[PDB]
Each structure stands twice: as structure tokens, then as C-alpha cells.
Write a protein that binds this DNA or RNA. Structure first.
Lengths: 337, 147, 56, 106, 79, 149, 48
RNA sequence: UGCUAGGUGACCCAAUACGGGCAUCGGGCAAAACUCGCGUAGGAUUAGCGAGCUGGGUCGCUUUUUUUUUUCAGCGGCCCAUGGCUUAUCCUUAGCCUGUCUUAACGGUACUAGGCCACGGUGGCACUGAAAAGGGGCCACGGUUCUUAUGAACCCAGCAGUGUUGAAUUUUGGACAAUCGCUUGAACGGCGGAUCCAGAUGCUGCUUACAAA
RNA sequence: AAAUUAGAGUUUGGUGCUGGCUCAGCUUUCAUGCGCCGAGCGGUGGUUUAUACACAUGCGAGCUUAAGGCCACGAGUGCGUAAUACGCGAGUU
């Protein structure tokens, strides 16, 4: 009988064009909220849901909200980036009041994936202090990090690779996160997906080389790259397990070239040469070009790979980014003769 | 994939489509033709009754709407009365103008001459089509000349 | 067939199925090998080829 | 073909004796033990039996053999052979069972 | 034959194999499996039970399994 | 159980009967030369003779009224054999002409000619001259130019 | 498939069009010539 | 979601030296559940469907979780487009298919084993479980017993066995040894009226005089 | 080397039709009489065919370190259901 009082409480927050107000309950579960945000397509509807239900959102609701923001970014035509940015600013104090007091590693990783998903190509930003503090708060306890999934940890790494400016790779909180995650993942190396190893290699290459404790951190990320890159090298060719994608081995090879260029002949480059030179048109060009830069910095010459990439080098057209690919591949070709 | 005639479009975003499917009976060794009715989603309501449409399975939208309209092959021409009056005007204008230009040459003689030379121009055209397709050859068969 | 039939001229089973005697390995005739008790792979004994040919 | 013939082809799987109801042998209690005179050219007084059968329905039964011992309230086993010499009667009392046993010195 | 079905039911598994535990005149066991789907099912994590594991090990296409951890006097006259 | 399992054996054989009968027309789809809907044949429990609708459509599209003119031809053969008439006279078609050339070629009969019921020819219709025409017609249109052959 | 289509379908169809159009030119030479002069002479004599 | 193998343990047990349980992760293949295309007993002495009888919008339809991209239904509430079917509904028969028998075949009809579904004296409903109940939970009915009458206990379409009816229907057997299942990290462990062995009993295939080595 | 169509008697003064009845065929039952029940190795089969009738009694799901952890697989019947059934064929979120 108190539906009209409930409706007046709904009217006091959101204007009268919303379908949420008939649907409104005070005693909602977060499960239904994750589905109800999963049912909308327009940024007006998530705004309606936010001013109705700011009080009941835990971290899963924020993660589904950011995915729905990306969904509206690619499907709602009337997108305003300014309204999205002020709403994204409104998302902050709810996180600092709740999710930084009750965030398990699953929820926080899901949010950081959602925010990096928003910043993905097919510019919206959050403060980086919240991103680092979410990173240290999700990993503050060792035990749940021991029971974490490889998909979770490499997803967290891809989030930290996409969200952060390059000046903040030397921040100590990222290094504390990398300390915890290396101390977890080096025991369960063999539970890893090769895609998860690809993102682990890329993120430790991105964050690694950025007084005794810091050089020890660089040496520890050196042992992480050498063991993990040999884990991918063992996982390539061993046909008994799922064969890693040549894109992933190529991009982890580029990570090896990045950490070799920053810190200054593994089997990984040889097997990467094989999986590229058998399957070039499945490879995008720029990852292979970065692998040619890795061949440059190692000084090794992979013959059928380089003639195959010569054939790939002819097969591009003329135009700005494509001519930049041709130019840098020609430059690394002259670097290798 | 079904290619079958529409029969109903009185129906919101949904057309009832009938398809002639032929079932075997084993008893008499005779294929019996039955026609089943399907309900199908269209999106533009471009299907007038008599259109020949292509329906395909997609995700179900209802209890009993189960296919989606892909393409309307042959359009059903429809009765527009004002356009029909326009064809009345153009057609009796053509008849009266031709009879006035023609009207000794009784008008049957002139039109039948024009139809003879039109047929002759046609026969010359398709004969030259056969000439460019085949070359100088007896019309024995094209299957012989396919070598 | 006549020469074969002319030159032809344990069963206790009760089985609790124990793996006592050696093992032989649409079914692909001729048989592949003989697996012994000791994990050894050996080709067919002559008598075993005889009673394989009697079996068909 | 012709579609009337296509629809032109489970009927009544008809028991040709409708009193045994598809079974071969049904017992029952003899209601009356009586004889009758038959159709010409037969004129010997044949002995019959009206029996309240197992299935609750009644039909007449031929009594075979050199005499018999059946009276009121007497159980028999009824078989499926008919006697032709009077119309409408289809039942035969098998002998080798109950109160109707075999005759003396057969 | 998963855990659900009985011994004689209709099974998606193609073969428990040409099999004859009865001794037959010499080389007393049967011809073994037909093949190429046995390795698929045992590859796919379908379990063996105990004696099919013994028979597969005994045929030498798999290594054998040690059964006894201890000895106490078994009664052979139970039948 | 082989009744159930041997249904779709001829189904994949019917599709190239479509493709080698009708290039560019597409469980199979059959366009009988009649109303515009292509008519569909597909699976059941009781197995089907696939290539009755495709085979029939190739028949009726190449040789229209194959069934009625074939049965009319062979019925008239049965007619005058059991009636002792040694001449067999048909309402001609593509089928009747072509398969009359077939049975004359194999020597089932000794010959055929187009004839016309010449009493109801006009003051001048076209008339069949056997000498001046070449001896054997080979199409319907040359044999439907005239009136009631 | 292309060999069957372009080396059979269009030329056998072309045989069908030119054969029925030679027949149609026969019927049209009839309906011009004999029909037209016959009916204009009939209408001429009927109006006389 | 469920199994099996891996890898982990600031855990527990065992260990004159090392393996199990227990938690979590992920590789393999897998079930499950839904959807639609068709098939299907006769009856006009069933002719309109007493109905949301079909569709569109709106919600509710109890989770985010790897890169460009991702998540059913009238099922309920509301409007609404007024249509949807016309062997439509309604009745009564009936588990269904492969089977088995026969026919030369097409067909026509009681089983074998086994595929799937349904049901557990009747009817309604819920917990838990990923999924629901044949000796699990609650209520009402109908039976069977007993009460000092107030009320409780039970439900063989599980096995044997009893009783009616029937022309006719079996032993109140033995056993976990073989499987196969459930379980347990000793122990050829525990249990299983599944099964395997024996009985009675139609059909069958197959022997049968004793003596003596 | 593909293994594939039995009639007769009955109707009438006789003959031929007209369709029906029966017998000879195969399969089938704790069918029903009459007769044997020597002993063994086996196959198999009972839809207690029916009553989805009422059940005496006994047994069928217990295992395992009081407490907790695992026991929806197997067996039976066909009431209901003429179609969320069952079968066949495609694709699965």
C-alpha cells in the first residue's frame, strides 16, 4: 500500500520521464542493480540510476557502470564527454567511502579493467592517486592474492598499463603492487594462460626499469622477465598444451626488446621468428615491426623471417601511418643489413 | 533459409509467411504438398501482401515469432488509384495521338507495319547477340558449340 | 581351405577375472601383437596364429 | 495421388467371437441345463447349456459327450467351438475339468 | 558410459573393446581394443575404473598400476 | 534402425541436381515452373526419395508437361495397339516431337510425320508441304505455327 | 559452375529466344501482310 | 555447472624422510537446459475457438570477470496494434520410436534387450542442491490398524511373499567373489533384492546303455 | 559374389461369374485336456500379460573420522499425455 510513498521518494530524486521509478525498491540487492544497469543503453538511464541508487553501490556496480559507459560510447549516438567526465568525477567519493574499506581483489580488478576498457581504442580520465590506491588496497592481503586467478592478475596489469601516465611508473605504490604480484605469481607460473603471461611480460617490461632497494627491484623484475619469457618459450612448440597465439609471443618479444632497451640470445625470439614466418597475414604489421626492433637490439639475424617480413614490407600501401611503418621497418632493416 | 510468400501484414512488426514445403508419405509413394505458416520479424514494414521474401532463423523474439526477414525478392505491384488515373490519361493520350498522327492507310496497316519492323529489329538484335556469342554457325545446338 | 582343415587334424574359465595368461592385441585382422604378463611386446606364437585362423 | 484415396487409408480389430472377449477360455456358473430340438435335417435332441460366464454376459454352450452331470449352481470351463445345428450358439463345454468331467468308459 | 548409466545401457562411448576374459586354447586372453577413440576418451579426462586400468596397463599401451599396499589372508572360498 | 539412419543420404545428392540443373537458384529448394514460390523438401523420420521434386522440376522446366504428354503418348500407343489401328496421332508438343524422334531412332515405330486436319484449313493458312519442307521437324514453334496439327 | 552457366545457360536460352522470335516474326509477317490487306479490302468493300 | 589428470599452499593428518586429505587456480573434454524446421489416432451425431484466443512498447524478469565486439521467452504488472487460428477448439482411444511376427516386397500388427518421456495411493507446495525428490520435508484427501477416542502410525507401479478377479501367473533362496555403482587414503575394506548365481515355468539348442582305463 | 509371390473344399439340374466362410502355413501362451516327469551343460523369455487393486511379515543406502563430511545412480509400471512428448535434421547465447 506504501507504493505511492515509495514513488514520491523516487520522484524526489529523478525527474518524471524515467522508467526506473516504477521499478524502484529501497530493499534492492546489488545483484539486481548489476542486472538493471546491464539492461540500459543510454547515459541518461545510468544517470537516473546513479541519482536513485548512489547509496547502494558497491564496487561491482561501479564496474558494470563503467562498462555501460563504454557500451554507450560505442552504441548511444548522443554522447557528451563532458557529462561523462563530471559523472566519472562523481564516482570518486563513493569509492573512497566504501570500496577502499570493503574491496576484495576481484571487485577492484573488475573496476580497473572497466576503466581501462573505457580508455581503449575502437579522452576520459580518472585521478591516478585513486588508481594506485585501489591497486595497493586490492593487494594489501597476501592470502587472496595467493588464491587469485591469472586472468585477474594480468587484467590488473593491463589496467595499470593503460591508465597510468609515464611519469608515475617510478612511483613506490606501483612497485609495492609489483612486489606482491611477483611474490604471488612466481610460484604459480604453470597455472598461467599464455595470454596472461603476455600481459605479465608487457607490464613488468613497462614498469620494471623505472638506491639499493630500487636496483634490487630492477634485478627482481629481471628474474621475472627471464623466467616468465622462458615459460612462454617452453609453452611455444610444446603442442600438448594450447599453443600460444603468434601475436602474443610477438608482443612479449617486443616487451623483451623494451626491457633490453631500457635496462642497457633467448629461444623466445627464435620461436617467435617461426610462429611469425609461418603466419604473417594473421599478424598485424606493427607488432612484427616491434619484433624487428627486438631483432635489431639482440643483433641476431632470422633469415626466412626477415625475407618474409620483406614480402610483408612490400605489401603495404602508401599513406601516413603505413609509410611510417615502412620507414621504421626500413630503418631496422638497415640496422640489420 | 526459406523463400516463401507473405499472406498477412496486419500485424505489428511481424509478417505471417506461408511456405510450400513438401512432405513424403511412405504409404502411397506420393509427395503430398502441405503449406505451413510462420511468423517472422520484419524491420521496415516494406512487405506488401504478395511479396516474395526470404526469412531466416534468428534469436526468438516472442512465443511464436521465430524467423527474421532478410530480403524481399519480387515486389508485389499495388493498386494506387491516382496513379491508375494517370495511366488512363497517358494511355488514351497515346492511343488518340497515334490515331491522329496515323489518320489509304487504315491505322491497322500502319501499326502492323510498325510491329513487323519492330519484330525484325528484335530478330536482328538477338541474331547478332547469337552472332557475337557464337560466331558463324548453324543453330544445331549451343551445347555443340560449347567446346 | 581343405589343406588347412586337414592340417588341424585351458578352458576352466569360472572367472573371477584375474590377469593370468598373456593378452593378444570392425576388428583389424591379423592381430597386432601379443602382450605378455611381464610388460613385454612380442610377435605371435605359431600356435596362436593357428587358433586365430581357426577362430574366423 | 488422388487425395481422397490419400486420406482413404486403426479400425476395430474385431474378435470373431465377441463373448470370450478376445480370450480363449472363460469359466462361469451354469444358469440352466436344458436341451432343444435342432434345425432340419437334424432332429436329435441336442443338449445345451446357458451359462452366466466370467465376463458377466450370457451365451449358450454345446454340451458334448455321452451324457453329463451338470445341474444348477455348477461351474464349467467354456471353450470356443460352436455348434452349427442351431443358429446363434457359439460355445463348447470342454471336458476334463470341474463338475463336468469325462464320461464313463470313453 | 559416464557415472550415470548402467553397464548395459545405450552409451555415447563407442567401445569398451573387443573383449573375452575367457581363456581361449592358448595366448589365452582376447584381442584387445579397436582404436583411435580410446586415446581420445582417456585424453579427455574420462576416468577408467580399476580393472580397465589394469587391463589397459597389462596390454602395455599404458603403464601398469601396483595394487597391494599390505597382505592379510584373503579367503579364496567365498564363491 | 537403418530406416532412421539412412534418411539424409540422398539429401546432399539432391543439391548438385539443383546446381547442375539450375545454375543460380537457392534442405533443398525446388522451383517448379508454376507459381513463384520455390517449393521445399527436407528431413523427417521416414526417409525420403530426394530428387523427386528436383528431378521433376528439371523435367518440367526443360520439357513442360512431361508427365501429361508422356502419358498421353504412351496411352495412345496402348490405345491403338489394343485396337488394331496402325496409326498413332497425337496433339504434339516438345515432348511428343522429341520422344517420337527417340522411338523412331530406336525403331520402336517406323516413322512419324506432322499432319494437319486439312478440311478446316482456311482459304489460305500455312499448309504442310512434305516435299518442300526438310524431312524432320525438331522444335515446337515450327510445329505450332499452323492450325490444329 | 561458370563453365556450365556461360557455356550452356545463356546460349540455350538464346536459342529459345531466337526460335520463338523467328516464330513471332512469322506470326507478325502474317498479321501485317495477309490480315491487314484482307481486312482493309473487306472494310473497303463493306463500306462501299 | 559436473568430472578427471596438473600447480600452489604462514593449513590438517601421516613420515627414521615425505604422501594423502583440505582450500584455491587453471588445461582437457563433457553433461545439462532452452529454442525452432517437419512428422504424427479417429469423430462433423466436434463448428467457431467463453480468451489474451497472437503480436508491438514499457518495466520486473536476483552478478562484473583477458585485447576491436558480445549476453533468450509472456513468465508476471502496465499500456496498447486489434488481431491469431480456422482438423481451430471439444470429445474419447492411446506412452512414443526402434523393435519382434508375418508378407515375396509394399504393408499390417502382443514381447525380446535397449533409446527417451511420464508417474510413484490422490492433490497442492517448499528447503537444500548446479539440477529434486520411488523407502527426504509440510498440509489436505482416500484407505489400514489401535485409543482409556483425545489423536497418532503407515501407503510394495522395489524383491520374495499374501488375498480378490483370472484360464493362467515363480522361491518369504544364496552372495558381494566377477562387474558396475556409492563410500572409505590401511586392510582383494563396508554395502547394494542393481547384478551375478541358483530354483519353479512357456519356448528353444544340445546331449544322454550300463560296465571298465 | 545381389538368394526375390502354393492352393483346395464350399452355392447350383449342371457351367461360368460374385464375394464370403473354412482347412492346410508361420508365430504365440505357467491356455485346456491326455503322457512321461532319468540327469547335465546352456540360452533365453515372462510387462502378476490385467488391478496405477488392499497389502501380513522379512529384506532392499548406507559408508566415514557423540558431532560433522558423502548417499538425484540403479529397479518397477504406463495413470495421465495426440504434444514443453518421441524421432529425425540444422544451429546453439
Amino acid at each position: 500500500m506504501r507504493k505511492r510513498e515509495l514513488l514520491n521518494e523516487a520522484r524526489a530524486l529523478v525527474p518524471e520521464g524515467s522508467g526506473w521509478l516504477e521499478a524502484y525498491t529501497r530493499n534492492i540487492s546489488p545483484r539486481q542493480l548489476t542486472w538493471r544497469l546491464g539492461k540500459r543503453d543510454s547515459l541518461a538511464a545510468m544517470t537516473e540510476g546513479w541519482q536513485l541508487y548512489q547509496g547502494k553501490f558497491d564496487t561491482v556496480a561501479m564496474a558494470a557502470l563503467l562498462r555501460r559507459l563504454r557500451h554507450a560510447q560505442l552504441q548511444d549516438p548522443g554522447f557528451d564527454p563532458l557529462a561523462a567526465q563530471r559523472l566519472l568525477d562523481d564516482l570518486v567519493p563513493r569509492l573512497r567511502s566504501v570500496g577502499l574499506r570493503f574491496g576484495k581483489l576481484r571487485d577492484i580488478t573488475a573496476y580497473l579493467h572497466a576503466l581501462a576498457k573505457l580508455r581503449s581504442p575502437a579522452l576520459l580520465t580518472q585521478p591516478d592517486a585513486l588508481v594506485l590506491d585501489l591497486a595497493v588496497f586490492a593487494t594489501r592481503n597476501r592470502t587472496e592474492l595467493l588464491h587469485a586467478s591469472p586472468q585477474r592478475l594480468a587484467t590488473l596489469l593491463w589496467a595499470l598499463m593503460r591508465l597510468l601516465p609515464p611519469q608515475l611508473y617510478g612511483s613506490e605504490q606501483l612497485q609495492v603492487v609489483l612486489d606482491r604480484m611477483a611474490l604471488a605469481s612466481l610460484g604459480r607460473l604453470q597455472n598461467f594462460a599464455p595470454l596472461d603471461l603476455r600481459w605479465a611480460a608487457l607490464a613488468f617490461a613497462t614498469f620494471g626499469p623505472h638506491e639499493d632497494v630500487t636496483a634490487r627491484r630492477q634485478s627482481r623484475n629481471a628474474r621475472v622477465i627471464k623466467a616468465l619469457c622462458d615459460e612462454l618459450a617452453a609453452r611455444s612448440g610444446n603442442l600438448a598444451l594450447p599453443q600460444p597465439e603468434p601475436r602474443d609471443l610477438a608482443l612479449a618479444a617486443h616487451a623483451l626488446g623494451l626491457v633490453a632497451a631500457a635496462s642497457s640470445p633467448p629461444a623466445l625470439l627464435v620461436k617467435a621468428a617461426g610462429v611469425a614466418a609461418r603466419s604473417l597475414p594473421a599478424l598485424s604489421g606493427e607488432e612484427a615491426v616491434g619484433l624487428v626492433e627486438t631483432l635489431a637490439v639482440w643483433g641476431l639475424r632470422q633469415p626466412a623471417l626477415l625475407e618474409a617480413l620483406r614480402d610483408a614490407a612490400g605489401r603495404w600501401g602508401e599513406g601516413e601511418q603505413a609509410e611510417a611503418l615502412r620507414g621504421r621497418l626500413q630503418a631496422a632493416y638497415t640496422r640489420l643489413g | 533459409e526459406f523463400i516463401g510468400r507473405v499472406v498477412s501484414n496486419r500485424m505489428q512488426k511481424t509478417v505471417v509467411v506461408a511456405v510450400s514445403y513438401v512432405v513424403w508419405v511412405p504409404k502411397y509413394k506420393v509427395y503430398q504438398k502441405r503449406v505451413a505458416r510462420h511468423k517472422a520479424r520484419d524491420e521496415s514494414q516494406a512487405s506488401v501482401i504478395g511479396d516474395i521474401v526470404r526469412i531466416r532463423k534468428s534469436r526468438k523474439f516472442s512465443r511464436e515469432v521465430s524467423y527474421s526477414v532478410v530480403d524481399t525478392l519480387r515486389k508485389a505491384h499495388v493498386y494506387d488509384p491516382a496513379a491508375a488515373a494517370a495511366l488512363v490519361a497517358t494511355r488514351d493520350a497515346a492511343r488518340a495521338a497515334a490515331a491522329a498522327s496515323t489518320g489509304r492507310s487504315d491505322p491497322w496497316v500502319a501499326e502492323a507495319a510498325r510491329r513487323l519492323d519492330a519484330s525484325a529489329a528484335r530478330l536482328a538484335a538477338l541474331r547478332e547477340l547469337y552472332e557475337k556469342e557464337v560466331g558463324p554457325g548453324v543453330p544445331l545446338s549451343g551445347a555443340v558449340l560449347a567446346v | 581351405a581343405f589343406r588347412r582343415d586337414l592340417l588341424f587334424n585351458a578352458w576352466p574359465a569360472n572367472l573371477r577375472t584375474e590377469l593370468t595368461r598373456p593378452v593378444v592385441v570392425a576388428t583389424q585382422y591379423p592381430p597386432v601383437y601379443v602382450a605378455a604378463g611381464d610388460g613385454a611386446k612380442r610377435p605371435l606364437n605359431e600356435q596362436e596364429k593357428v587358433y586365430q585362423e581357426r577362430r574366423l | 495421388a488422388t487425395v481422397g484415396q490419400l486420406l482413404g487409408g486403426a479400425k476395430t480389430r474385431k474378435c470373431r467371437i465377441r463373448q470370450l472377449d478376445g480370450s480363449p477360455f472363460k469359466k462361469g456358473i451354469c444358469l440352466r441345463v436344458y436341451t432343444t430340438s435342432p434345425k432340419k435335417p437334424n432332429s436329435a435332441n441336442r443338449k445345451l447349456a446357458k451359462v452366466q460366464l466370467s465376463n458377466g454376459l450370457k451365451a449358450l454352450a454345446y454340451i458334448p459327450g455321452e451324457g453329463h452331470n451338470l445341474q444348477e449352481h455348477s461351474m464349467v470351463l467354456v471353450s470356443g467351438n460352436g455348434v452349427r445345428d442351431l443358429p446363434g450358439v457359439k460355445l463348447r463345454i470342454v471336458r476334463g475339468r470341474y463338475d463336468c468331467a469325462g464320461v464313463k468308459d470313453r | 558410459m559416464e557415472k550415470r548409466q548402467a553397464r548395459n545401457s545405450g552409451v555415447r562411448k563407442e567401445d569398451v573393446g573387443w573383449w573375452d576374459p575367457n581363456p581361449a586354447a592358448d595366448g589365452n586372453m582376447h584381442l584387445g581394443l579397436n582404436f583411435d577413440r580410446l586415446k581420445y576418451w582417456l585424453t579427455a579426462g574420462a576416468k577408467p575404473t580399476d580393472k580397465v586400468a589394469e587391463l589397459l596397463g597389462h596390454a602395455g599401451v599404458l603403464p601398469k598400476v601396483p595394487q597391494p599396499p599390505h597382505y592379510n589372508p584373503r579367503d579364496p572360498k567365498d564363491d | 534402425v537403418s530406416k532412421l539412419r539412412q534418411t539424409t543420404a540422398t539429401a546432399a545428392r539432391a543439391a548438385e541436381v539443383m546446381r547442375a540443373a539450375f545454375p543460380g537458384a537457392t534442405t533443398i529448394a525446388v522451383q517448379l515452373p508454376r507459381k513463384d514460390v520455390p517449393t521445399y523438401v527436407m528431413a523427417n523420420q521416414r526417409p525420403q526419395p530426394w530428387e523427386l521434386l528436383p528431378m521433376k522440376a528439371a523435367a518440367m522446366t526443360q520439357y513442360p508437361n512431361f508427365f501429361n504428354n508422356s502419358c498421353t503418348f504412351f496411352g495412345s500407343i496402348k490405345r491403338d495397339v489394343v485396337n488394331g489401328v496402325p496409326f498413332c496421332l497425337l496433339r504434339p508438343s516438345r515432348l511428343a516431337l522429341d520422344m517420337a524422334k527417340v522411338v523412331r531412332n530406336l525403331g520402336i515405330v517406323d516413322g512419324f510425320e506432322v499432319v494437319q486436319r486439312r478440311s478446316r484449313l482456311g482459304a489460305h493458312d500455312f499448309v504442310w508441304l512434305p516435299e518442300q519442307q526438310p524431312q524432320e521437324p525438331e522444335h515446337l514453334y515450327d510445329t505450332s505455327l499452323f492450325r490444329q496439327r | 559452375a561458370r563453365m556450365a552457366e556461360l557455356l550452356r545457360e545463356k546460349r540455350v536460352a538464346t536459342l529459345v529466344e531466337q526460335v520463338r522470335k523467328a516464330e513471332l516474326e512469322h506470326k507478325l509477317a502474317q498479321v501485317q501482310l495477309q490480315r491487314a490487306v484482307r481486312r482493309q479490302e473487306e472494310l473497303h468493300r463493306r463500306e462501299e
